Nucleic acid binder design. Structure first.
Ligand SMILES: [Mg+2]
Ligand SMILES: [Mg+2]
Ligand SMILES: [Mg+2]
Ligand SMILES: [Mg+2]
Ligand SMILES: [Mg+2]
Lengths: 772, 773
DNA sequence: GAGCAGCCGAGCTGCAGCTCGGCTGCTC
DNA sequence: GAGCAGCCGAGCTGCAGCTCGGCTGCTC
DNA sequence: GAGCAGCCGAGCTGCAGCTC
DNA sequence: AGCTGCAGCTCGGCTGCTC
């Protein structure tokens, strides 16, 4: 058998076939690592190619459960032709018309078992290994029972001590993350994440293959397996919506001891832990958070952009910026996916996902006609922080107070941003995930400004009304779909908004001219869909696309005497006319307002109001958290600057005899009443909590006097320093002035920043989001 | 016509066929940009549209048709007939290979009026890709060039924007810009942009480029010189390229540049002499290494970027991340995928690998000898890490401040070349082609190099005086033998060539020949497949089984019954190749092509490994002088600065400085008291300053070295720290003058000291499989 | 009788698959 | 009048291919 | 609203700290 | 000499004023 990317065991299919293992790795790179370990005469029987074969799974394998129908059980033509699954069936000699119930039939296979060597990320052991188990369970459940399906367990994270040869190994990112927060310090630790099998170094691969047999686990079937395979991989997404609303239930210590002592894993437990953990992670990766409308990748890209560009906004190529984001924000996935999200994050065309892109795209970033799929490759085009928009919408002062994600024991991106405006309902989104779909249509900016200002401005005439409405979850002000960059019409019919294109009829020339398409409808795909209809093309002799870069003009030349037959074979409803029916110039803005909670998990909203009402408390509270901490540091900075002024007012006074070292100089300052200060924390509070700031700022030392430069002893410098103190005490009164406000602390500065975000949006809109 | 990556003009092939343009872009990204400009109702009729413009992709470098023809008539090699890119161009245009297109009627049977090459402005685009396109038409339809059927669209490569001026300055060659930047006082108020592809232009620039589309379309013309020039640059004889690429490109005269621009016509012969030659020269500098450090431009960027990236923390980083760092900070103007491959190749360490002393530590699966390093993981799995102990000893950091540097986009990039402690060009394995020249080297034995270099440097060694007496007369006294590291076989010299041999063992009973070593740089899997491809050799073989370890060889060749006697007969036993070493092709020849790149540019043909080492010695000898001479200058100045500081704090309480109001008044009194005006940043951080610039600028004066003094410097322990610092400085300074006065030349003793340091690192790397754990 | 392939550094690009639900074609 | 596949998006898993250039090897 | 200037803020080198 | 985690230094960016 000569299957692609297959390297046989020497004894495969022979007399000793049932002694052979078929190793199934994720791809070529993992395969090359397995070959590295399978070819040692220094392991002195580890395995070798005498009895071990290799085969590539080609990434995620096809879900056979959704591609079969039982009359018998027939495999649909996509599943029958899958090159990856064909190669496994051929290499193993599997038979689809055999149940493999008897020991004699099982010995007609070309290998004794198949050992899944998937990577240890949730994608590997949860989804890919899950999908592989569902394949065998669907067609040969007997093979699972008799241990024909095994797996190789490898670590996902290794943590090495500086003074220890052997490391501590983890198999789930949760295992590490909990163990790391409960660690006193990781300065003497380097965390390594193994994104694929090919990531282990030579000494680790030798260790992994010396102990190869003690790390092969065998899968078993119970009664719960059959339903669980249907919940996780069946046709009914409702069953996933029920299962994926709760967290993973961990294994009991009695359970983990049985599994490891006999090295057998029931399929049902694998589905409840590994596969479920992936699908939960998959939701957090693809469905955005309702607070800031971002996914994990897009939040990493923004946090990485702020670090990369807020100090120096020189443009950078996309693949370079992707490297920065992946480095500094600890991105554990493929470089090419992250580069696509960067490009899509910066596209600004009529109907694009983002009405307010986080970056300025410099180069060819895609047109409306091809759904932004005609953007240049990541090596030609560059991005640049839309700084004026970003600084007004994501206040830098607030990022210190957000909860943060920690990857590999180090701080990464925020768990969520809390922007000044409800970004989750101000943009276009549409993509699926596990269990839930996600689709949202951007609300009108003026409707959003009206809602938030009523909530915040005490002088608004609907302020008290809105608060009484939020409490009972009623609606008083409209939240209409946005019409910006849309020349068509929006109409409401009952509970649904509809988007309409625009057309012109010239009865003489017999041309229908489409001058706008429905919302988010790409031009080239639209024209191709009207040629794929035999019904409609009977009346069309030609379609010609004269559209601008970003305006629509399609010339539909009709066949002689068809306009009268069109009105007949296409009905005219009170909500759509016959030509709008003929040319499919109307869609429905169906929403799937499923989002991600701050502390994890899905959340099903019922209206755009509910999202806005849920986001308000987080933005309200952050303005308080911000002002409360600016108060704490200002209090502290005045203490530090007044202490410095009093020192240099007494400089020649305290230095009255020569002192030996820096610890003696601290004797003199302590006895004279100068406070020991942690100047590093007072100048740079960073992520310190107020309770931690007060605790640690005053337990310090006196570097703030000893690092003082002689030039700060000058009179002109001193008056500069003392007027700085006036600045801070005027500010501190203003700060606690703002804390005392109605309806809540910081209401007036929230209003100030809403005007700043509006001004930035207007400037960007007037410049096609270029800001030049 | 349904061709891949083709978008027709609406009038193509119709009544108005000859009114249509076929725009030929490099690829999809460039194609999508042209579609952006061809679809404006805000520009035009001033600009073109899809009414009369079509587009098609050239798919990067196009096939060189000149090397795929033979004259029987002229037959096209069957690989050239099946080239999908050139097939599609002929289809779209309706071109006929049996048609001369001499008359206006024949040319009107084509489906377009002309073809406009819209290539990028890098030398790859206009020099290579556009050159090969012109050579294609010149080879088959030269009449089409004469009648102006082959045109091109000129776009800028570099744009410089001023922070007051709205209109930028545009350049069409990187050299024209580079000169314009050296003649500028400062470009601090300028943003330079390099446009590696068409898709790099922004929306406002593409709009500007499309009003003046017709004013930027140039037409090609044929001369009498064209025929010979097309053969020199694209013909079958590489000898003609070796002749042409020995000189720089001779620029166009102002008379030539004015005629070309006034009529928008470009002679083919002139384009080949300027654009294509400029590429082929750049291609040589990119792929042929410099003989001083054995590196190419990409690998030097990768090392220079590695030092910057890793000097803060040698924490490993994934390859694609490090590649992004290098491309950003070292100004890499090329594809992301190429740079990522060169990073991987720079870190491979297996028997027969290119590098015996890699600059990085590969962490993960980086490839085996069995697959020629082609089984390395993708750049997203594997990580790199500076081989710091090797790098610090081989490329001394003090020297990098004193090397010449290349400046890209007006900013300092990687060094022009490194000058390593040992002649790296002859210590590693290389083999790849370029334009005009091939490159192949086989690593010399490290011990022979250490023996030769130490003799040159060590005054107290037999025989220092002998070797120098030999270099003058161009003799060779000590051997430079091929390296044996990671090689189980034997090396033999026969005439002008060394040969490497594999090893085999015969078990007459079991009838198995077991190959236990292969020739140098021979990958295992490809070797086995070549003897599976021979019917001559497989007549005697019943099976081949590979039991080889990771990096030791064990191939079991089981023979057919009674063939061992037919082997010794049906092959040959030479005094140089045993029948079985012949039967199993266990011998290669160490063909060398010691072609390199000179400092400050150009190729150079060496004839032996000694000459390369002899050429490298003066650069390393002199650099040790430049190094010590500048450390002397900086030591003198730092001593002046620290003694002035000591005197200040000894007089601090006397001339107390809280006494005066302003900062410039405090410097007046300090001036009046004799304290010297010092440019403290330059004495503390000289960086890339030459001594002549150091001496000129050191006394520019500031007195910040006193005003920035922290209160802690008034402490007893701090001042005593200063005088022990001053002592150590004066000492070092005395030691420096000893090293400057040394024989045979300045710094001989530290060169020998550093040769020991690099050796210890090489030994350490070898003892740890270049992992250093 | 050329052609195929190998290297490095470059110029361009291309697929398989998962998830969900609305629509539209198709099919029976 | 009622069944399937097909498509699509984001974010993921995993890969593939055509060229130039110089010389030497191999088979053919 | 755009120059001009001064000061702020954190990204990312510098320089102790602990070696070996 | 020689990392490398901290702290601290730098300068492009803001922020104020003025024209
Ligand atoms: Mg993986
Ligand atoms: Mg995580
Ligand atoms: Mg005093
Ligand atoms: Mg190009
Ligand atoms: Mg350059």
């Amino acid at each position: 058998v000569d299957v692609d990317k297959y390297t046989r065991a020497r004894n495969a299919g022979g007399k000793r076939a049932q002694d052979c293992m078929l190793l199934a790795a994720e791809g070529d790179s993992a395969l090359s690592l397995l070959r590295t370990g399978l070819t040692l005469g220094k392991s002195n029987p580890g395995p070798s190619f005498d009895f071990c074969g290799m085969i590539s799974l080609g990434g995620v394998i096809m879900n056979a459960c959704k591609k079969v129908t039982n009359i018998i059980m027939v495999r649909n033509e996509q599943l029958t032709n899958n090159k990856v699954l064909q190669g496994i069936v051929q290499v193993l000699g599997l038979d689809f018309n055999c149940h493999y119930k008897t020991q004699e039939e099982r010995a007609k296979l070309r290998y004794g078992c198949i050992v899944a060597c998937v990577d240890q990320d949730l994608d590997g052991c949860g989804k890919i290994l899950g999908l592989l188990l569902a394949y065998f369970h669907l067609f040969w459940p007997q093979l699972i029972i008799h241990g024909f399906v095994k797996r190789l367990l490898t670590p996902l994270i290794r943590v090495y001590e500086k003074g220890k040869t052997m490391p501590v190994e983890f198999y789930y990112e949760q295992e590490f993350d909990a163990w790391a927060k409960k660690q006193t310090s990781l300065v003497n630790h380097t965390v390594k994440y193994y994104k694929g099998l090919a990531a282990h170094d030579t000494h680790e691969v030798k260790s992994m293959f010396k102990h190869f047999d003690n790390m092969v686990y065998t899968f078993t079937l119970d009664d719960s397996a059959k339903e669980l395979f249907h919940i996780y991989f069946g046709g009914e997404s409702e069953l996933r919506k029920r299962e994926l609303c709760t967290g993973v239930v961990p294994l009991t210590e009695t359970q983990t001891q049985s599994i490891h002592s006999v090295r057998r894993i029931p399929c049902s437990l694998h589905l409840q832990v590994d596969t479920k953990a992936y699908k939960l992670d998959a939701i957090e990766r693809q469905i955005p958070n309702f607070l800031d409308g971002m996914t994990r990748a897009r939040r990493k890209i923004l946090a990485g952009g702020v670090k990369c560009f807020a100090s120096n906004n020189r443009e950078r190529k996309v693949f370079q910026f992707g490297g920065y984001v992946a480095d500094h924000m600890f991105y554990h996935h493929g470089d090419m996916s992250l580069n696509t999200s960067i490009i899509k994050a910066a596209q600004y065309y009529p109907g694009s996902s983002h009405l307010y892109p986080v970056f300025i795209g410099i180069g060819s970033f895609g047109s409306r006609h091809l759904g932004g799929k005609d953007a240049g490759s990541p090596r030609y085009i560059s991005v640049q922080l839309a700084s004026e928009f970003i600084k007004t919408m994501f206040p830098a002062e607030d990022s210190w107070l957000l909860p943060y994600v920690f990857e590999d024991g180090q701080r990464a991106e925020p768990e969520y941003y809390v922007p000044v405006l409800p970004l989750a309902i101000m943009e276009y989104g549409a993509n699926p995930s596990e269990g839930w779909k996600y689709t949202t249509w951007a609300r009108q900016l003026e409707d959003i400004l009206a809602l938030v200002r009523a909530y915040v401005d005490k002088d608004n005439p609907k302020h008290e009304l809105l608060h009484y409405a939020i409490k009972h979850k009623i609606t008083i002000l409209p939240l209409r779909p946005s019409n910006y960059n849309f020349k068509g019409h929006l109409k409401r019919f009952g509970q649904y908004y509809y988007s309409y294109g625009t057309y012109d009829i010239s009865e003489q020339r017999n041309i229908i001219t489409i001058t706008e398409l429905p919302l988010r409808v790409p031009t080239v795909a639209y024209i191709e869909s009207i040629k794929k209809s035999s019904n409609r093309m009977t009346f069309i002799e030609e379609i010609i696309d004269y559209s601008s870069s970003e305006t629509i003009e399609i010339l539909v030349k009709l066949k002689p005497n068809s306009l009268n037959r069109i009105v007949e074979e296409f009905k005219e409803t009170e909500e759509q006319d016959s030509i709008e029916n003929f040319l499919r110039l109307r869609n429905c803005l169906h929403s799937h307002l499923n989002f991600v909670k701050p502390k994890g998990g899905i959340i099903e909203f019922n209206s755009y109001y509910e999202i806005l009402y849920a986001w308000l408390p987080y933005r309200r509270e952050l303005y308080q958290k911000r002002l409360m901490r600016e108060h704490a540091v200002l209090k502290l900075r005045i203490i530090m600057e007044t202490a410095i002024v009093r020192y240099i007012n007494e400089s020649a006074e305290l230095n009255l005899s020569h002192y030996e070292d820096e610890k003696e100089a601290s004797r003199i300052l302590s006895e004279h009443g100068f406070p020991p200060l942690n100047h590093t924390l007072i100048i740079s509070p960073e992520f310190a909590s107020i309770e931690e700031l007060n605790q640690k700022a005053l337990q310090g030392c006196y570097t703030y006097i000893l690092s003082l430069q002689a030039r700060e002893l000058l009179i002109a410098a001193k008056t500069r320093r003392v007027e700085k103190i006036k600045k801070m005490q005027a500010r501190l009164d203003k700060v606690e002035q703002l804390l005392q406000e109605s309806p809540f602390p910081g209401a007036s500065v929230w209003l100030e920043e809403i005007d700043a975000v509006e001004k930035a949006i207007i400037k960007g809109r007037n410049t096609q989001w270029k800001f030049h």
